[PDB]
């Protein structure tokens, strides 16, 4: 959508080719190269690089078989998902050292949930994805004992301790309750109650904020609490929030100007930016 066919007068000169999504062998080669580069940080797991890729490639495969665009428009999959997978595992393994395979697959499953499971809508698809994650981990690594995949919480947070470590669900609930307490005191007087999935999404937003990634897309009904949670997580991690207040006579050059303001204030100055805007801020495809 938003794409217009090229004129036959101009297509005659230009040849075009179809570069489809890379095949299983090509994905295996590329992301195996990425893994072999990645796991040289900790020599104790070099021999589990090829099978690690194979498992990710297979998971990507049956994630693409189902979850078509007919089911949901946001149900799209590209090797971009895999590169974010590799980048997230590397960012998590960056501080981790002398890590056994236990942690390797623990973060692998965590990233699998955070990429192929949180985008889902109905519970059956979510449990299917979790079952497939466990089944693939068992299939490619059957010598590992079963303490990592049956861990139902399977949640991470840099907030406790000093580096990216698995945390306890209630030990994190009390901590985030205290932080949200201190939060509502500083801005957002309206009380915020902390239930289960709100804890889940604040963890997911924190995870997406920490990595050298570009954007978070939040899908949900209005007034449910996407913007407030984004602001709250930005408050934890010291990300300044820039909101654009559009109006009727708002124009595209204003979007250009505040975009370049965000880029200069984020790149020229090292302070981190969480730039938040909604559908009402978008008017035209430009």
């Amino acid at each position: 959508p938003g794409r217009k066919p090229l004129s036959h007068r101009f297509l005659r000169h230009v040849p075009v080719v179809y570069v489809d999504y890379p095949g299983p062998a090509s994905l295996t080669q590329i992301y195996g190269t990425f893994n072999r580069a990645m796991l040289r940080l900790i020599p104790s797991l070099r021999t589990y690089a090829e099978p690690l890729t194979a498992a990710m490639v297979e998971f990507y495969t049956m994630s693409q078989e189902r979850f078509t665009q007919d089911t949901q428009p946001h149900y799209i999959y590209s090797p971009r998902e895999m590169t974010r997978w590799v980048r997230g595992i590397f960012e998590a393994l960056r501080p981790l050292e002398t890590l056994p395979v236990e942690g390797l697959i623990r973060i692998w499953a965590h990233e699998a949930l955070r990429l192929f499971q949180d985008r889902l809508v109905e519970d059956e698809e979510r449990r299917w994805t979790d079952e497939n994650i466990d089944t693939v981990a068992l299939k490619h690594f059957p010598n590992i004992d079963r303490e990592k995949a049956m861990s139902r919480p399977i949640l991470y947070s840099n907030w406790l301790s000093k580096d990216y470590i698995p945390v306890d669900q209630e030990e994190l609930r009390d901590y985030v309750k205290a932080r949200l307490k201190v939060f509502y005191e500083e801005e957002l007087d309206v009380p915020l109650v902390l239930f289960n999935e709100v804890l889940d999404h604040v963890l997911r937003i924190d995870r997406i904020f920490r990595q050298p990634q570009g954007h978070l897309l939040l899908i949900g009904v209005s007034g449910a609490g996407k913007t407030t949670l984004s602001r709250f997580v930005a408050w934890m991690n010291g990300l300044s929030v820039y909101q654009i207040k559009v109006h009727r006579k708002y124009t595209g050059e204003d979007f250009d100007e505040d975009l370049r303001t965000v880029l200069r204030r984020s790149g020229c100055k090292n302070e981190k930016i969480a730039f938040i805007m909604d559908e009402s801020n978008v008017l035209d495809s430009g």
């Binding site: 428009p73 799209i76 985008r119 889902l120 239930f195 999404h201 997911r204 978070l216 899908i219 449910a224």
Partner: peptide, 19 residues
């Protein structure tokens, strides 16, 4: 599809009964 593919997508649905 390009935007729904270029970032990480999170389904933040309506509050459940427990919520």
């Amino acid at each position: 599809p390009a935007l729904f593919n270029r970032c990480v997508l999170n389904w933040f649905g309506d509050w459940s009964t427990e919520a």
